[PDB]
Curated annotation (Swiss-Prot):
Disulfide bonds join 3-50, 13-27, 28-73, 48-87. It comes from Triticum aestivum (Wheat). One of its GO terms (biological process) is lipid transport. Keywords: Disulfide bond, Lipid-binding, Lipoprotein, Signal, Transport. This is Non-specific lipid-transfer protein. A lipid is attached at residue 7 (Cis-14-hydroxy-10,13-dioxo-7-heptadecenoic acid aspartate ester). GO terms for molecular function: lipid binding. The keyword Disulfide bond applies. Belongs to the plant LTP family. Plant non-specific lipid-transfer proteins transfer phospholipids as well as galactolipids across membranes. May play a role in wax or cutin deposition in the cell walls of expanding epidermal cells and certain secretory tissues.
Length: 90
């Protein structure tokens, strides 16, 4: 998992994190799917790198929405479009 499919999976959730209407009916199904499939540390560490490289370029990144993605639908992710996680022991 060299951050190739995970990107498009969390990409739909960014639409909300930016501070606009979203995320999308794909953010919950899309991210819950990857999350569910992520049964190894590898899939948790790889995915974290995806959002990290991305979020790093978001100047007006919003934590309120980024953190409101999982509690909304009920995906519960151990990381979002923010730099407040380790993804080491998740």
């Amino acid at each position: 998992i060299d951050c190739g499919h995970v990107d498009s999976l969390v990409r739909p959730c960014l639409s909300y994190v930016q501070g606009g209407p979203g995320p999308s009916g794909q953010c919950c199904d899309g991210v819950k799917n990857l999350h569910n499939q992520a049964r190894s540390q590898s899939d948790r560490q790889s995915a974290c790198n995806c959002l990290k490289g991305i979020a790093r370029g978001i100047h007006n990144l919003n934590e309120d929405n980024a953190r409101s993605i999982p509690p909304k639908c009920g995906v519960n992710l151990p990381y979002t479009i923010s730099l407040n996680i380790d993804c080491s022991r998740v």
